[PDB]
Amino acid sequence: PKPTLWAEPGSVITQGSPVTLRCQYRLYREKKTAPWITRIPFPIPSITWEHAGRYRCYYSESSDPLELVVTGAYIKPTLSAQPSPVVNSGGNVTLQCDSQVAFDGFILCKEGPQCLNSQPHARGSSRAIFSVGPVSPSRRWWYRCYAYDSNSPYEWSLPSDLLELLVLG
């Protein structure tokens, strides 16, 4: 009787912040063991990178994967709008996420979160380009981006500052 596995508040949590994996036991982590589980009497008081990973749950066939992501490990990237963050209604714009740290993984998240994943724009650039729109003055178009290493895809950087598109009515 296949159980369920979610996380409270969610599955994308900033380092040092709390999270509880709830299942409806023997929780485990894919690839590498997670010793924090074998010290529960499933709450984590303050999430570190140690907790990041793919988790399943059984007691039945094992549940759907929960990808527990830890953010804030690295310094943040810079997100910019190209050529401009001001755009005419119905228009598209290119969003540019630059990390000063060498990373090959980039995540663009829209707030007010739905996130898009991407590789770098060139061989060894540490910069991703995204296309968004068409945009509209009736809705808000607010974004942040993360950078990560594809070898440890569950540990993300601090997010960039918020980028707001200004959409001209």
Partner: protein, 276 residues
């Protein structure tokens, strides 16, 4: 087999808190033999192998003078480069330099090299022929002008094919017991439960020298290239190196897996079976 000598230099600027930190280090193959730290109290080129320790005060006096000269030129280089890319006075910057010689199995010169970096990106490299430069930049070409004008390439090829390889050979004989002899890896396998259905098999290689090694997992003879995680070869602290390789495996199937080990110190390639 083939041997090499290489020298590595790193200077890093320190806005406000005085002169740049200069560190130099010399290697024969995978063994460190000299060092210089501009922040140490000795202010001297220091030995880091018993076999170089036998060199007399002439060696230590002379080497110290040359590494001090290396220190000074790199100190100025920092200022020069901060100009070339018109960067501000804030922020620390880094210049790096690597050069040395490779000898074949015969102990005769094979290849020489001399590279330079600024803030961790390639800056200028001496080509293979030892007579021309790859100035793969814009400001690096300003450095290429000065250096083919001053005949740096001419006197580098003289160093590299000459005193580099001659002193390497002296080092190879003096450190015979350390540099010409190998440590074969001590190997073993460990097992780690992941779930009721899956488990990790890890293949260990320990106390080996030199660092070059290949560890692969095979299932039923077929290589598991995609599914093998390899850590970076790492130093033990005692002159030897370590490495391991792991694969996630379905429980009940461990017996199908073999670890395979290639290293100089082994007279033939090892095949470790989980279940012989």
């Amino acid at each position: 087999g083939s041997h090499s000598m290489r020298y590595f230099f790193t200077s890093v600027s320190r806005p406000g808190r005085g002169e740049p930190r200069f560190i130099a280090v010399g290697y024969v193959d995978d063994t460190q033999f000299v060092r210089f730290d501009s922040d140490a109290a000795s202010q001297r080129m220091e030995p880091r192998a018993p076999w170089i320790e036998q060199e007399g005060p002439e060696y230590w006096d002379g080497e110290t003078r040359k590494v001090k000269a290396h220190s000074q030129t790199h100190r100025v280089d920092l200022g020069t480069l901060r100009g070339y890319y018109n960067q501000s006075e804030a922020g620390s910057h880094t210049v790096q330099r690597m050069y040395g010689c490779d000898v074949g199995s015969d102990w005769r010169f094979l290849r020489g090299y001399h590279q330079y970096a600024y803030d961790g990106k390639d800056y200028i490299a001496l080509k293979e022929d030892l007579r021309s430069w790859t100035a793969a930049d814009m400001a690096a070409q300003t450095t290429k002008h000065k250096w083919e004008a001053a005949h740096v390439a001419e006197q580098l090829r003289a160093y590299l094919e000459g005193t580099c390889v001659e002193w390497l050979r002296r080092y190879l004989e003096n450190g015979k017991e350390t540099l010409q002899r190998t440590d074969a890896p001590k190997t073993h396998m460990t097992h780690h439960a992941v779930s009721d259905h899956e488990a990790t098999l890890r293949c260990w290689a320990l106390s080996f020298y030199p660092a070059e090694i290949t560890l692969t997992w095979q299932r039923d003879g077929e290589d598991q290239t995609q599914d093998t995680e390899l850590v970076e070869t790492r130093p033990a602290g005692d002159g030897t190196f370590q490495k391991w390789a792991a694969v996630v495996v379905p429980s009940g199937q461990e017996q199908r897996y073999t670890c395979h080990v290639q290293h100089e110190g082994l007279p033939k390639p090892l095949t470790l079976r989980w279940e012989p």
